[PDB]
RNA sequence: CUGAAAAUACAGUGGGGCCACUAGGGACAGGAUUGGUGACGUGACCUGCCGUAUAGGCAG
């Protein structure tokens, strides 16, 4: 699964019709987040889900925050955001309601967010998830 | 399978001549628009060379 996801990162710049900060995640990686088995049960994460996210944590690690956009500025939708947090979709809308998670362009007053349109950056959606500590994080070892 | 079928309105043409709207004339007095407001930092326009030159030319 790592080597399958490694070629998509190396050949990310090849596929670009627009800039990284304007392109969606499913345009480069393709369905690999919303196909993943859900963690609605117990808050017990799937071994497929543990392996996917732990690759994305080292992606933003290798792609620091510079003035040129890179692979860590790909746009993520509210459903793909809901899976990466492992919570309900209303709970992730409520974080948007109290401006905890910051969209990536301003909707103009009658814009209610399309649930499939890529709203948030991959970047700080991960950093929000690393603000919550669970036992098998890479920080301790 | 119709108040059923069918159907060539046509040819020609001189509105013309004349004409005084005119005289007179006060729109005028009064007037409080007012309170309150962040254009940008997910962005390409960089790094150097020649030249006396904020002239003018150039390399990725």
CA–CA gap between residue A21 and residue A128 (Å, rounded):
19
Q: Which SS3 state, helix, strand or coil, does residue A4 take? A: helix
Distance A136 CA to B30 C1' (A): 86
Strand B lies under 7 A from the Cβ of residue A69: yes
- Determine contact, residues A40/A121, Cβ cutoff 8 Å: no
Q: Which of A123, A134, A117, A94 is nearest to A20 (CA)?
A: A123
Q: Which of A41, A45, A38, A36 is nearest to A1 (CA)?
A: A36
Strand B lies under 7 A from the Cβ of residue A26: no
DSSP conformation class of A39: -
Q: Which SS3 state, helix, strand or coil, does residue A125 take? A: helix
Sign of CA dihedral A10, A13, A14, A15: positive
- Determine contact, residues A94/A44, Cβ cutoff 8 Å: no
What tokens appear for A30 in the block? Answer: 């393709």
Residue with tokens 């799937």: A46
What end-to-end distance do the CA atoms of chain A give, in Å?
22
From which experimental method does this structure derive? cryo-EM
Strand B lies under 7 A from the Cβ of residue A19: yes
Bridge partners of residue A121, in order along the sequence: A75
CA–CA gap between residue A22 and residue A129 (Å, rounded):
22
- For strand B, give the nucleotides within 7 A of a protein CB: 42-45
The resolution of the experimental structure, rounded to one decimal in Å, is 2.6
């Amino acid at each position: 699964f790592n080597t399958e996801l490694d070629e998509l990162s190396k050949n990310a710049e090849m596929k670009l019709i627009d800039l990284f900060n304007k392109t969606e995640f499913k345009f480069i990686f393709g369905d690999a987040i919303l196909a993943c088995p859900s963690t609605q049960k117990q808050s017990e994460s799937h071994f497929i889900y543990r392996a996917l996210l732990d690759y994305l944590v080292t992606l933003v690690e290798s792609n620091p925050k510079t003035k040129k956009p890179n692979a860590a500025d790909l746009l993520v939708s509210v459903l793909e955001a809901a899976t990466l947090l492992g919570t309900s979709v209303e709970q992730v809308y409520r974080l948007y309601q109290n401006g905890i998670l910051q969209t990536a362009f301003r909707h103009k007053m009658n814009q209610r967010i399309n649930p499939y349109k890529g709203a948030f950056f991959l970047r700080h959606v991960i950093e929000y998830k690393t603000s919550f500590g669970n036992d098998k994080a890479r920080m301790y070892l």
